Amino acid sequence: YKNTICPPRQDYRYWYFVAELTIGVNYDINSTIIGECHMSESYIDRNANIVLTGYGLKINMTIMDTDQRFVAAAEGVGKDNKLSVLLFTTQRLDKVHHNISVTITCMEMNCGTTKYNSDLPESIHKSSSCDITINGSCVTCVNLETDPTKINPHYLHPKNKYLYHNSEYSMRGSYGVTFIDELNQCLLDIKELSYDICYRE
Amino acid sequence: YKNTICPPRQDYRYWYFVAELTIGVNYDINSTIIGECHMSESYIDRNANIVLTGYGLKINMTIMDTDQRFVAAAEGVGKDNKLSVLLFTTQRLDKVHHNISVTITCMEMNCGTTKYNSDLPESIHKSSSCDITINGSCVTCVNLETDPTKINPHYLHPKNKYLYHNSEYSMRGSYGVTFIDELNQCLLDIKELSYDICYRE
Amino acid sequence: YKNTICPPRQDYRYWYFVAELTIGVNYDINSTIIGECHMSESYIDRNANIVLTGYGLKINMTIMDTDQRFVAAAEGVGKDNKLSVLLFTTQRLDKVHHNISVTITCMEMNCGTTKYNSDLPESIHKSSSCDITINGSCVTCVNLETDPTKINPHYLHPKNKYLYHNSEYSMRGSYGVTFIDELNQCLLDIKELSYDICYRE
Amino acid sequence: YKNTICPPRQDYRYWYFVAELTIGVNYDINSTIIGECHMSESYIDRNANIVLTGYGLKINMTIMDTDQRFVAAAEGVGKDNKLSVLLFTTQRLDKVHHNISVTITCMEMNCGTTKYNSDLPESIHKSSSCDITINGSCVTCVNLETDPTKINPHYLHPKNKYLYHNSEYSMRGSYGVTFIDELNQCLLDIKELSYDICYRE
Amino acid sequence: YKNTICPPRQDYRYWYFVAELTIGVNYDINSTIIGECHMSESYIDRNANIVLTGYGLKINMTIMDTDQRFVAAAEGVGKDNKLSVLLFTTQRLDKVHHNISVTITCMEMNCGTTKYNSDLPESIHKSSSCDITINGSCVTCVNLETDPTKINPHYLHPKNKYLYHNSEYSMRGSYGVTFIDELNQCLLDIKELSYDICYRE
Amino acid sequence: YKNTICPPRQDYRYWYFVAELTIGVNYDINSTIIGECHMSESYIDRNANIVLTGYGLKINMTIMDTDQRFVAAAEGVGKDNKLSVLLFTTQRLDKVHHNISVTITCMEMNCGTTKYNSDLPESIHKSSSCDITINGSCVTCVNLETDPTKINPHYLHPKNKYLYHNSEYSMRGSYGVTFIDELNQCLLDIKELSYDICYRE
Amino acid sequence: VIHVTKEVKEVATLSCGHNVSVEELAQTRIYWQKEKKMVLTMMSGDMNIWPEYKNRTIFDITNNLSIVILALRPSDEGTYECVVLKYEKDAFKREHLAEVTLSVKA
Amino acid sequence: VIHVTKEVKEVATLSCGHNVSVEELAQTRIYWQKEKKMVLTMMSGDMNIWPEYKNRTIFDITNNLSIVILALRPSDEGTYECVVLKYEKDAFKREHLAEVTLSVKA
Amino acid sequence: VIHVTKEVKEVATLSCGHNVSVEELAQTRIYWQKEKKMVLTMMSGDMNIWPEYKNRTIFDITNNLSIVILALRPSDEGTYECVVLKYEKDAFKREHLAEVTLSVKA
Amino acid sequence: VIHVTKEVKEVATLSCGHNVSVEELAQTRIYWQKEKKMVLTMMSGDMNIWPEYKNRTIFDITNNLSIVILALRPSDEGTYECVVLKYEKDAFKREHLAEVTLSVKA
Amino acid sequence: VIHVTKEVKEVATLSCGHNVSVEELAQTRIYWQKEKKMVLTMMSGDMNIWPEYKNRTIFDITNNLSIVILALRPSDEGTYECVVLKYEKDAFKREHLAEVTLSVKA
Amino acid sequence: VIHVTKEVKEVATLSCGHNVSVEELAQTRIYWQKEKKMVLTMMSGDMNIWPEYKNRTIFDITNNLSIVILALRPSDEGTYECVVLKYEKDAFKREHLAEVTLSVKA
């Protein structure tokens, strides 16, 4: 007997906090808009891909060789144009780091072809890499905290849903790149932060 | 002249308490959700099969060589994640024990292939067996009290419906399995128990 | 010139009290349900057939060699599970007794094949017979008072409709059978009796 | 230049009181019902035919060799089961009497084939005849006052419509038949008389 | 460069008072009815034709060899059965008189074939003629004041629309015919006059 | 890596004030009408064309050899019949002047073929020309201030939209023509000026 | 319609204008009525008569099936309609509805 | 329906109009009831009887299956229906519902 | 339109501008009216005249079908329209609606 | 179900009706409970016992896997169900749920 | 844009930056205006001038089509735009909208 | 994560666990921060330092890129994360986020 992934459902109530993705942008976003984020998920050949379009950014994150499919996403706008993305999958069947490829295309402002297209090694445990490709000059910084210990305090979980998050430091991996001399100011002020659940989950 | 089963109807008002099915799960279910349970019934070659999906469990119970078809089901959530299922058929034409096969697949959490797939002999009168197959590790215990003497006190019967239950100890059969050292804690606390009638009856 | 039957209409306002049909059942019916009775009428080769399904009984009454077609029916539930059926046709063109065949199939409880299938002679004037066939053991007694002198006092006639009933003892015929030692307790208590007009008239 | 009849319209506002038709019936009609009368008009080969069904009577009145088509009808129920029909055409282009054929079929009570089928000469000026055919025994008397001098006082003309009636005794023709010894009691009491405008005008 | 007519629009807001058409009728019209007038316009081979049906009259007015198409019409009922028609086109590109043909068919009362079918010379400047054809005896008088100096005071112009009218006596042409000894009583009393804008403009 | 234009969207929230177009007309426009302006945009072979129809004018403005497509337009009516058009594109990728062709057809009043069809050199920096073609005599003056330093103070920007405007004098180009001796009275009084956002953006 | 005028308190003939034979009179129902209020009936040869007009009317069948009003009064002024029916196919067929109006000068 | 009339305080026969044999009487249920209120039963040859009518009725089976009402009173006036059923196919088949009405003259 | 001006209390010709023959005058209806208020009619050769203008107007048919206003007053100031109709196909066809305006200087 | 009745303050055997061997007793979980309230457990050969019934029950495994209730009281009256489970495929399979009812006569 | 700065009460040239010929000057309309308030016009060779700036401005056409502001004051500080139009196809085509800003130091 | 514990008022090394070379140190940005509050930065070889920790920290680059906390206090207790970034493709790529926790026993 081996634990498997369930067949896909229309609505999922068991969400697992897989990644805290923060993207800083030079163009102005004021605050969170309800119903802005539209996400599309696909689990094909043990690869969980989520494509969420919101606030002028299309983020295509793919987790490779994994037994968990994405269930949900939440996109919020912080102060100083920081965009915080909370991502959710089914459950953590295996306790191993997975290689990721996250493609961040600017679809509304500062718009162009591939700008970076490089591999970010995970800073903790060095067991995975993010093949991150940015189609545009809009992105200022990217911080991807996968399997985060701490859930963002002002993320309101939807009712009839159940949140589980990783509580082990041995499982959290941080991927970081900053394109300007910003000293990793991807850290949001979080004072006016709100979160909206994405559509097509 | 011999008593038969009637042709199927869209809505049935004469319900017979055939089985008290209790399934304990390790994953968390808070309380009863209205409209959660979706059941599908089929009477093919004197076999009454009911497939009800609710609270992360798909339960496929089949009663073999019987003259009664299922009419309704009611699923409720108790404390300590115990899930109570009340099942109903037309009427008890024959006073004999019937062989059952109940397939309990975990469809939302702790998800996998067949884990037990064994035969539970009925503890009272030893005249029937439950070929019970669990597709997953979510199930902690199963207690199937067929033809129960006592209806659960906080099950509210729907109006314009008529409930009949077996009142003979010679007819009640209990099928029980516990997969953890639980000393048959399938017995619900019943303090916060509520029941919701399933859909597609 | 000879009096004929009119072509059929969608709605008929001239109703004639043709028969007081009372069926006792062993299974429990509490009280009258609005919209329960569904009747279907057909006048084919001078034979007026009405098929009304309600309260677990399908009653197929056919009047043979007659010049009147059924217009309406009313089904009510009395105390001690007595079911009273009031039946209506167009008008009494001929003052003669007609042979009847009434088929009473139990469709919800105590369900089976033909149990009696016999001929009840009319007790008054002995000029007609009821070929009555019961498909099931649910029926306890049948009393069919055709062309009744007295309309049931708590039958509320619908507005814009006109009721005519036979006022001659020479025209009323009673058909009676009791399957248990009941001393013809088909006589309702009539205290809590209500009547609901059927559908598809 | 010669005066013609206009092409037909969906709604006509210029009504001409052409005929006061009174039909007595033996079966009971209580009072006027709003929306009961349904009339259908046809002007084919200079013949104006109106077929109005209401209160258990289908009246097929045809005016032959005429230059006016029917526009409207109004059916009301008087005391002692007298049924008053007010009929309307476009306008009186020619000042001559026209041969009429009025077919009165009983469609709900006292129902049969042709009972009278005879010619009523007009009593005033003797210039026209009514070929009147009654399909049934329901009709007790028929009085057809064509081109009436006096409009019924409690006929409320519809708003935005214009009524014109003949004011000459030289133009009014009365057709009368009574089938029972009634001394022409077709004359309504008119105390509780109301009028409802027909449909499909 | 030469001034042209614009392509047609669904709704026109620049209306030009082209003609004051007054038609007297012998049959009775009480007052103005909202939504009565239905007009249809067509500009084919420099000919502006408007066909408006209302109050028992179909008026087919065609202006020949012109650079302006009709935009709107307004029909009102005056005292003594005078019917006033206000007609509107786009704008006056050329300052010349145009030959007109106005066909006035009685469609509801006093109905027939062509009665007059003659040419009315314009009384002022004698530069144009009205080929006026009346299909019926309903029309008593016709007064057609084209390019009128004075707009009728109780014509309420629709909001978001702009009215322009000719202010030169050298441009106004009056066409008049009276069929009875009426001394041109087409002049309305204007005391109870109201105007309703036509449909399909 | 080179900055590109994004793929087109249904709704754009990043608007760039590209041009202040003012058109004076001899025919009367009272004030701004909500929902009057209907604009259509097309970006074909690096050419951004916007066709907006409102207040009797169809304005076809095309910017040639450019990397920005139009997003929105706003049309308002000032005093003395001045019509102010505010136009918006995506963003200013290149800091160069672009050749423009603006076709202004009068579609409701003073209507005709091409009247001017000439090239207006830009008065500041002389680096671009407006091939402006007027189909009609309705236009009195045209002032096209491209890349304006100052946004009109009583233009209310829509919520959830972001306005950016050029702040450099080196980028603003003014195209001006006056067809009457008006001393460039295209300058609105701006006292009663209001702005309405166009449709089909 | 015949507007017969005649002076007060005088014998007053009211012509029906329809001639019936005495063999046909048994099969023919004749009745007079003014303002829908009945005056006299001759049903199957029976000369029944109303209490308002018992003693002052005489039916003359031959002279156009008339009534003769004796000692005429302004209360008798009005429109008299004369109704004649004949028995055809088990139905009384109305064949005459002549209306005459009597005016009283005093 | 037989409207039998009879004077007060007298023996009163009420004919059922149906003749049953004494061999068939064990298989035939006969009972009388007036105004839906039961009077006497003869169920399988047992002549059970109601407290209102214990001591004043005598069943004469041969004379058309009748009751004889002794010392008849106006309270006994009403419509008596006589109900006879026969056992066929494990069911009592009703074969007689003759109604007679007794009137009391005092 | 002819703006004829003329001093107060003077004979005042108002030209219609249409010449009709005396044979055609019987078939032609001519009438003058100011501010829709009627002044004189010449219907089929009958020179009917309104009470406001009975004694101070003289129709001169030959001199352009005119009226001569005697002792002219400021009440007579206004716009006079002259209406001429001819009988064609059983219909009076209007052929002249010339308007002249009279101004009074005092 | 065995309705065993027995007098107050007496040794009281309650038969389970299931015989288990002492080799199988280590792999078999036996527990008694009355009215869903637990009485004693024999989990893997450990005779654990509840504070209500510590000192007055003796398990006799051989004599149908019974409890002997010492000094029986009316509080001990009720329905005792005896539950026996066996370890199969890493799961305890319930094989006995015999219910006996004890009544107290005093 | 030329930010010309100059001390208070001094002759102040404001360059338009566009050179027009004297033959073309009759066909070219030149006017200066500060803060949308008009200063001087040279319409078809007519040097019209506003009452605020009648006596302290001198147009020098040759020296880049300039105005010379005499006795300059802080009220004259602001942005002057110089507008030049040429007659083409019966339309004045704007060809120059150079803006200069004058600052007053006191 | 290394839970280094050390007594109050003592020199306190905090290991980053990442070794950088002195040639690479100019191209590598190292900074320490506790509870998201910044402690010291080594940006392009410049050892900038925060006013809370100016005079009591010494960076030892060779000994696992550490800070030595002098005169340690319970205010210094917490979780220190050590962040190291390297310049790749005109972007600082984060390569180390080791967290150590210092506990103060007093």
Author numbering:
A (entry chain B), B (entry chain C), C (entry chain D), D (entry chain E), E (entry chain F), F (entry chain A): 20 to 220
G (entry chain I), H (entry chain J), I (entry chain H), J (entry chain K), K (entry chain G), L (entry chain L): 35 to 140
Please give the exact wording used by the authors of the publication that reports this structure.
Poxvirus encoded M2 protein is a member of the poxvirus immune evasion family and plays roles in host immunomodulation via the regulation of innate immune response mediated by the NF-κB pathway and adaptive immune response mediated by B7 ligands. Here we reveal that MPXV M2, co-existing as a hexamer and a heptamer, recognizes human B7.1 and B7.2 (hB7.1/2) with high avidities. The binding of oligomeric MPXV M2 interrupts the interactions of hB7.1/2 with CD28 and CTLA4 and subverts T cell activation mediated by B7.1/2 costimulatory signals. Cryo-EM structures of M2 in complex with hB7.1/2 show that M2 binds to the shallow concave face of hB7.1/2 and displays sterically competition with CD28 and CTLA4 for the binding to hB7.1/2.
We finally determined three complex structures, M2-hB7.1 hexamer, M2-hB7.2 hexamer, and M2-hB7.2 heptamer, at an overall resolution of 3.04, 2.7, and 3.12 Å, respectively. We could not obtain a three-dimensional reconstruction of the M2-hB7.1 heptamer complex, partially due to the few cryo-EM particles of this complex on the cryo-EM grids. The resulting structures reveal that M2 forms an oligomeric ring structure with B7 proteins binding to the outer face of the M2 ring in a 1:1 stoichiometry. Structural analysis reveals that M2 interacts with hB7.1 and hB7.2 similarly. The interfaces of the two complex structures have very similar atomic contacts and bury a total accessible surface area of 1760 and 1617 Å2, respectively. M2 binds to hB7.1/2 side-by-side via β-strand complementation mediated by the C-terminal half of the M2 β11 and the N-terminal part of the hB7.1/2 G strand. The long C-terminal loop of M2 sits on top of the shallow concave surface, formed by the natural twist of strands G, F, C, and C’ of hB7.1/2. Extensive residues from the C-terminal loop, β8-β9 loop, and β10-β11 loop, and to a lesser extent, the β8, β9, β10, and β11 strands form a network of both van der Waals and hydrogen bonding interactions with residues from strands G, F, C, and C’ of hB7.1/2. Specifically, residues E122, K123, F126, K127, R128, and E133 from hB7.1, and residues M120, R122, Q125 as well as N127 from hB7.2 form hydrogen bonds with corresponding residues of M2 protein. There is a total of 12 residues on GFCC’ strands as well as CC’- and FG-loops of hB7.1 reside in the CTLA4-hB7.1 interface; however, 8 of them are also contacted by M2.
